[PDB]
Structures are given as structure tokens and as C-alpha cells.
Design a binder for this molecule. Structure first.
Ligand SMILES: CCCCCCCCCCCCCCCCCC(=O)OC[C@H](COP(=O)(O)O)OC(=O)CCCCCCCCCCCCCCCCC
Ligand SMILES: CCCCCCCCCCCCCCCCCC(=O)OC[C@H](COP(=O)(O)O)OC(=O)CCCCCCCCCCCCCCCCC
Ligand SMILES: *[C@@H]1O[C@H](CO)[C@@H](O[C@@H]2O[C@H](CO)[C@@H](O)[C@H](O)[C@H]2NC(C)=O)[C@H](O)[C@H]1NC(C)=O
Ligand SMILES: *[C@@H]1O[C@H](CO)[C@@H](O)[C@H](O)[C@H]1NC(C)=O
Ligand SMILES: *[C@@H]1O[C@H](CO)[C@@H](O)[C@H](O)[C@H]1NC(C)=O
Ligand SMILES: *[C@@H]1O[C@H](CO)[C@@H](O)[C@H](O)[C@H]1NC(C)=O
Ligand SMILES: *[C@@H]1O[C@H](CO)[C@@H](O)[C@H](O)[C@H]1NC(C)=O
Lengths: 605, 30
């Protein structure tokens, strides 16, 4: 609809497409099976955000109902977008930067914004896998290292911050991270973490070495395994003590939370991360298929499994939170029992849980001034089920504490950390496909130097930039970039893909070309959401961002062991030079989409 | 022994051997 000239003789033509696949068998890779393509697309949508990000948002935002919100927004943003992304790579036969430079070559910023976004997400997601395989190496020993406090020098008492905090909370901040008190104070490289980082990048270079003919078998294993383990964790989780008391708590509807501008944003920004939209990897994976492959049936099957898995991991996660909260309620209520037995001389099995409150008043009516020194607790469930931990603590200080109280402790910890590893790995494959393929269409290296050499300089180049998160303050740097980065770029890049296919390429040329592949020109549901609904629905997510950014009082959490009233929380209000980092990681992937479009329109004219 | 160092050890071994068996199969495809 927008007047771009010369669209033909820049893209392949429709009558020429039946001859192009019997010559792109050379000089272009190809899938072996159809299941090799669906398993590497499920692994790119499902990873590490269904574990510690979705089940918190499913409950904290009026769970049981948030399902509703998350659903609608899905079959509205997600479906339409994913479909249009699968059908644009199969037709134009290029990667991510080659598709948007084929249609109006003055655009070209959507390819460079997808490469900068895939570089920054895959930079810090390879440090989370670095932390995960550190907890995997510290398995294979029956007293796990996060099970008991160490002794200090004289072997008479514990270490001081292991006694005020928890031993698990001590293994993360002092024996894994060696964290500092601020983001300003940084130290050395912390060798162990560095070795682990090396291992992670090395394991990543072995799987994605020769492009797509290695990540095939890789995807197979790294895509099934995760599922089987997740299952095994369901029939163990639903048996322990306190599951079905953490499943009910997840699915309690609170309809007041639906009328909130902050609910529909993170429900909207999870859909763009429950899938892998606006990343540039799903277009490069779809471009290897046959020309008559059904891409309408693939986008429904991929989105049904992604909507079913996000509920399925939340059942497994909140079964373990329900077991940990029932255990902490019983090891609290047995100490309120133990106080009066040690003060009023009663038999052992005397004064259980059924008779606590009536035996409170039998003692104070027997003899006063002996109840006044008694310290009791006000501990109760829905206060042990209601901690707001999120993002890394749901696996390193919450899930791994409930594993130590199970029967076979060093076996449920090996099975738990190899699964997370697998998830991370599949996501990594995705992001790597995202940064290598646009770096070949730019031709930064000569057409010598085969596929082993370009991937080796990406895995070694992103390794040296990953030294930031190995410092003492390296966990404050990783909690900074994540959110911001992701969110902003994702939304913005996602809007201009829906715009430049419908109004620059033309939705009438699109329909014809699609029909040429499958038959049966798409329904009234596809024509409505492509044209009016999903571009409008992606603007109110972009409008709600600058509503919740201007009033949330941007802060961050520190540890600070030498601090009065220590183990509660802390928020100490980021320094003024950190806005340089926020502008850099969130702004310049957003600004290369207009920035190249202004440069190309003034170089010619 | 510092038991996490031997697991890491064994894993690194395999990783490296694999990368090598991977860069020499790619020279037997010319
Ligand atoms: C359930 C998890 C375990 C594994 C499940 C396996 C998935 C099997 C599901 C069905 C797969 C087989 C094909 C399904 C239909 C495709 C046919 C087709 O699309 O023809 C074009 C069909 C008809 O074409 P026509 O002939 O041109 O009219 O048009 C459409 O597809 C329009 C439908 C709009 C898409 C909305 C789909 C709603 C997804 C549900 C939302 C997420 C639910 C998640 C909740 C949790 C559940 C687990
Ligand atoms: C002239 C100006 C440009 C050159 C100046 C130097 C450029 C920068 C140095 C580049 C060095 C590498 C390129 C060497 C030449 C390439 C051409 C070639 O090899 O063909 C001959 C050779 C074939 O020779 P033929 O036997 O005569 O056929 O090809 C190969 O052997 C390539 C073998 C694959 C090499 C890939 C491994 C290198 C990167 C390793 C990265 C490991 C990362 C691990 C994960 C991270 C851990 C932290
Ligand atoms: C259901 O969701 C509402 C929405 O936030 C929760 O509400 C608030 O309660 C706090 C009390 O700490 C007030 O300061 C807020 O003003 C309330 N919000 C509104 C919009 O009225 C409520 O807690 C949730 N229900 C339950 C049982 O937790
Ligand atoms: C604790 O250890 C220190 C040396 O680290 C020693 O001087 C002190 O006497 C010890 N305390 C006790 C009670 O033994
Ligand atoms: C980090 O650990 C080293 C010993 O491994 C210790 O000397 C140093 O004080 C720790 N860093 C901080 C900030 O406490
Ligand atoms: C607790 O002590 C009272 C006092 O004699 C006794 O009647 C009751 O049976 C005891 N409870 C149990 C479980 O033994
Ligand atoms: C015993 O102590 C409780 C706790 O404050 C109090 O509520 C109760 O009234 C006391 N009993 C008497 C007889 O005052």
C-alpha cells in the first residue's frame, strides 16, 4: 500500500520458486526430517522463563484468572505474529536481515535490531547456564554443600552470616557469587565462576559448530529430556506432604487484579518471550523448509504446546513451593510446642497441634508470671506460601532447599540441574542462530574461512565480554540488563514486522503468495488480526510501558551482611551513571530502526 | 579432592575431545 517501486527483480518470483529448491540443495542447508524442525522450534520457545518467571506472574497477578488474560492476549498477538513470521521466511528464502532488506532496502534496521537484541539476550543467558552447571558439579556427594553451615576458625560456632541467614542463602551469596554490597564496589574475576563460564561457552561451541547439521541431533536430545524430567518431577512432587496445598493457592481467582494496567503489560510481554518473536531466529529456521510446507498448521501446533507447557511447569513448581511451606510451618509449630514443654514440665507427646490454644490458657490459669517470658511465633500458611522470589531465587535458594529434605537428596539435584541445563542449551541454539546468520549477509569475513571459523570467533568474542558477570558485583549487572533490554527491543521490533509486511510488502501480494504454497487463502480471523487488531493491541502494550516506567521508583536489591536488621531486604536506588547503561542496552536496538531509515533516505536524495 | 573439580575435569575432557573429533570430520568433507 505504501508506494515502494522495484519490488520485483529484487525478491524471487512465484513461477521461479518451483525450480529454486532443486538448486539450493547445494550452498544452503536443509532439514533432515519435519520433527527436526518442530523440536528445534519448541526448544527456542520453551526455556528458563516458564520456570521462574511465569508461575510467579500467574499467581502474583491474581492467578487462576491471569490464565484468562494470558490466554486472550495469546490468540491475538502470539498466534498472528508467529504465523506471519513462519510464512515470511519460507517465501523470501533468506535469513532475518535478508528478508527486510529485500522489501524496501532502505528499511534494513529490523535485521540490525534483531542482531543486537539476540547478542544481548544470549550474552547473559550464557551466564545463567554458567551458574546452573556450577550447581551440577557440586552434586554427586551425599551431604550437599548447601545443607549445613561451615565452622569459622576455632570450631566452636558457625560462621556469623550463615547463622543469621539460611545455609542455602549462604551458599549463593558467599560461596558461589562472593557478592559485594553495591554495584559500585567490584573486585577480581573470581576464578571458579570463570572456569564455569569457559565450560558453558565450550559446550555451546560444540553443538552449533557446523550450522544446522549439528544442532539437529542436539535439538533431539536437548528437547525431549527436559520433558521427561519435568514429568518425573510431577509424580514425586504430588506425593510429598504439601502439594495440593500449593496447587490450590496458585489457582485462587482474585478478579480485582484484572483491572490493572500493570497486569496486561507483563501478561503481554511474556507472550513475546514465551515465544521467540522479534528475535530473528524463527525466520532463519523457517527458510530451510520446502516451498509447499504447511506453515499454517505449524504455527498452531507450536503455540498449543507452548500454551500447555506454561501451565504444566507451574503445576510442578508450585507443588514444591507447597511442600516447602508445609515443612517450614511444621518446623515452626514444633518449636512453639517445645517452648512450653521446656517451661511447664509436661510429658513428651503432650500438647500437640490439635491442642495448642487450649493448652496455652491452661498454663496461664495454672500459674501467672511464668507465661510472660515465653516467646511464641505467629507463623501460619499463606505467609509461607507468599514470598515474592523471582528470576534466580526460584532455583537456587527455594527449589534446592526443598530437595535436601527429600529422601534421595543427591539424585533429585542431578536430575533437576541437567533439565535446566537442557532448557538453557536449546534457547542458546536459538540465539546463536540469531547472531551468526545476519553476520554472513553483512559479509564481514571473505567467502573463504568455513562455518567452523565464524562460529568460533563469536563464541570466543562473547566469552571475553562475559567477564563482567564474574566479578564480585556481577549479579547486580545481570539483574540490571535483563528486563529492560528484552522488553523494549522485543516490543518495538515486533511492531514493525507486522507493519512492513501488511503495508509495505502488501497484504494482497502476501495472500496470493501464501495460497501458492498451501492453497486456501487465509480466513477472516487471519485477515482481521493482521490488519487492525494486532497492530492496535501492540500499541497499548507500548503505551503502558511509559506509564509503569515513570512511577515505579527504580531500585535494586543488595545483600550487605554487615548491616543493621540484616536478613529482610534492601533497596538502595541505582547511581546516576547507570542511565548511560540503560540508554545503551534498550535504546540503540530501538533506534537503529529509524536511524538507518533516515540515513538511507538522505544518501540518495 | 575438592569433588567438584574432578567432575568438571571429566566434563571438560569430553567437551574438548568432541570439539576435536568435530573439526577433523569437517576436513574429511572436502
Ligand atoms: C495438549 C498438549 C499436548 C500435545 C497436544 C498436541 C497438539 C494437537 C492440537 C491440534 C493439532 C492438529 C491441528 C490442529 C488444528 C490445525 C488446523 C488448522 O489450523 O486449519 C486452519 C483453520 C481452518 O482453515 P480454513 O480451511 O481456511 O478455514 O483455520 C484456523 O486455524 C483458525 C484457528 C485460529 C487459531 C486459534 C487456535 C487456538 C489455540 C488455543 C490457545 C492456546 C490453548 C492452550 C491451553 C492449554 C491446552 C493444552
Ligand atoms: C589477511 C588478513 C586476514 C588474516 C589475518 C588473521 C585473521 C585473524 C586470525 C584468524 C585465525 C583463524 C583463521 C585461520 C585461517 C582460516 C582458513 C583455514 O583455516 O583453512 C585451512 C584449513 C584447511 O586447509 P587444507 O588442509 O589445506 O585444506 O581449514 C581448517 O583447518 C579450518 C579448521 C577449523 C578451525 C576452527 C577453529 C578456530 C576457532 C576456534 C575457536 C574455539 C572457541 C571455543 C569456545 C570458546 C572457549 C572460550
Ligand atoms: C486482589 O488484588 C487486589 C489488587 O491489588 C489486592 O489489593 C490491594 O490491597 C492493598 C493492601 O495492602 C491496598 O493497599 C491496595 O490499594 C489494594 N488495591 C486495590 C486496587 O484496591 C488484594 O490484596 C488481592 N486479594 C488478596 C486476597 O490478596
Ligand atoms: C575463636 O578463634 C580465635 C582465633 O581465630 C581465638 O582467638 C578465640 O579464642 C576463639 N574463641 C574461642 C571461644 O575459642
Ligand atoms: C571473595 O573471596 C575472597 C576469598 O576467596 C575474599 O578474600 C574476599 O574478601 C571476597 N570478597 C568480598 C567482597 O568479600
Ligand atoms: C497430655 O497430658 C494430659 C494430662 O494428664 C493427658 O490427659 C493427655 O492424655 C496427654 N496427651 C497425650 C497425647 O498423651
Ligand atoms: C495468659 O497469657 C495470654 C497471652 O497474653 C493472655 O491472653 C491471657 O489472658 C493470660 N491469662 C490470664 C488469666 O490473664
Amino acid at each position: 500500500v505504501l508506494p515502494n517501486p522495484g519490488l520485483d527483480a529484487r525478491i524471487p518470483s512465484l513461477a521461479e520458486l518451483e525450480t529454486i529448491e532443486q538448486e539450493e540443495a547445494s550452498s544452503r542447508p536443509k532439514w533432515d526430517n519435519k520433527a527436526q524442525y518442530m523440536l528445534t522450534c519448541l526448544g527456542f520457545c520453551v526455556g528458563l522463563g516458564n520456570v521462574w518467571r511465569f508461575p510467579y506472574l500467574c499467581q502474583s497477578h491474581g492467578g487462576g484468572a491471569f490464565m484468562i488474560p494470558f490466554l486472550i492476549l495469546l490468540v491475538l498477538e502470539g498466534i498472528p505474529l508467529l504465523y506471519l513470521e513462519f510464512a515470511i521466511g519460507q517465501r523470501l528464502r533468506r535469513g532475518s536481515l535478508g528478508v527486510w532488506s529485500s522489501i524496501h532496502p532502505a528499511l534494513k534496521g529490523l535485521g540490525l535490531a534483531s542482531m543486537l537484541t539476540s547478542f544481548m539476550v544470549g550474552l547473559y543467558y550464557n551466564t545463567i547456564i554458567s551458574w546452573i552447571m556450577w550447581y551440577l558439579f557440586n552434586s554427586f556427594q551425599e551431604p550437599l554443600p548447601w545443607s549445613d553451615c561451615p565452622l569459622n576458625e576455632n570450631q566452636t560456632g558457625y560462621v556469623d552470616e550463615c547463622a543469621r541467614s539460611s545455609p542455602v542463602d549462604y551458599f549463593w551469596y558467599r560461596e558461589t557469587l562472593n557478592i559485594s554490597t553495591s554495584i559500585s564496589d567490584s573486585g577480581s574475576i573470581q576464578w571458579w565462576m570463570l572456569l564455569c563460564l569457559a565450560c558453558a561457552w565450550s559446550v555451546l561451541y560444540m553443538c552449533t559448530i557446523r550450522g544446522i547439521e549439528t544442532t539437529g541431533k542436539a535439538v533431539y536430545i536437548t528437547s525431549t529430556l527436559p520433558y521427561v524430567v519435568l514429568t518425573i518431577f510431577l509424580i514425586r512432587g504430588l506425593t510429598l506432604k504439601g502439594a495440593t496445598n500449593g496447587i490450590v493457592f496458585l489457582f485462587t481467582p482474585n478478579v480485582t487484579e484484572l483491572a490493572q494496567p500493570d497486569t496486561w503489560l507483563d501478561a503481554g510481554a511474556q507472550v513475546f518471550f514465551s515465544f521467540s518473536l522479534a528475535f530473528g531466529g524463527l525466520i532463519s529456521f523457517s527458510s530451510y523448509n520446502s516451498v509447499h510446507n504447511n506453515c499454517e498448521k505449524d504455527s498452531v501446533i507450536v503455540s498449543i504446546i507452548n500454551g500447555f507447557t506454561s501451565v504444566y511447569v507451574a503445576i510442578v513448581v508450585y507443588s514444591v513451593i507447597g511442600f516447602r511451606a508445609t515443612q517450614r510451618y511444621d518446623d515452626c509449630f514444633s518449636t512453639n510446642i517445645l517452648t512450653l514443654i521446656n517451661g511447664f514440665d509436661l510429658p513428651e507427646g503432650n500438647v500437640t497441634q490439635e491442642n495448642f490454644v487450649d493448652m496455652q490458657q491452661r498454663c496461664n490459669a495454672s500459674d501467672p508470671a511464668a507465661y510472660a517470658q515465653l516467646v511464641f511465633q505467629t507463623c501460619d500458611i499463606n505467609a509461607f506460601l507468599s514470598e515474592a522470589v523471582e528470576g534466580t531465587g526460584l532455583a537456587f535458594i527455594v527449589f534446592t532447599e526443598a530437595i535436601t529434605k527429600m529422601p534421595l537428596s543427591p539424585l533429585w539435584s542431578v536430575l533437576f540441574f541437567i533439565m535446566l541445563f537442557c532448557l538453557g542449551l536449546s534457547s542458546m541454539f536459538g540465539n546463536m542462530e540469531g547472531v551468526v546468520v545476519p553476520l554472513q549477509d553483512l559479509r564481514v569475513i571473505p567467502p573463504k574461512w568455513p562455518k567452523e571459523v565464524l562460529t568460533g570467533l563469536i563464541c570466543l568474542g562473547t566469552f571475553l565480554i562475559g567477564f563482567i558477570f564474574t566479578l564480585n558485583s556481577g549479579q547486580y549487572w545481570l539483574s540490571l540488563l535483563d528486563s529492560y533490554a528484552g522488553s523494549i527491543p522485543l516490543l518495538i521490533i515486533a511492531f514493525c514486522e507486522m507493519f512492513s509486511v501488511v503495508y509495505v510488502y502488501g497484504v494482497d501480494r502476501f495472500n496470493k503468495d501464501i495460497e501458492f504454497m498451501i492453497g486456501h487463502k487465509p480466513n477472516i480471523f487471519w485477515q482481521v488480526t493482521w490488519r487492525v487488531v494486532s497492530p492496535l493491541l501492540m500499541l497499548i502494550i507500548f503505551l503502558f510501558f511509559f506509564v509503569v516506567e515513570v512511577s515505579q521508583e527504580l531500585t535494586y536489591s543488595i545483600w550487605d551482611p554487615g548491616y543493621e536488621e540484616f536478613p529482610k531486604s534492601q533497596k538502595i536506588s541505582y547511581p546516576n551513571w547507570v542511565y548511560v547503561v540503560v540508554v545503551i542496552v534498550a535504546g540503540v536496538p530501538s533506534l537503529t530502526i529509524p536511524g538507518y531509515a533516515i540515513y538511507k533516505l538522505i544518501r540518495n536524495h | 579432592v575438592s569433588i567438584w573439580l574432578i567432575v568438571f575435569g571429566v566434563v571438560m575432557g569430553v567437551i574438548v575431545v568432541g570439539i576435536v573429533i568435530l573439526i577433523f570430520t569437517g576436513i574429511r568433507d572436502r
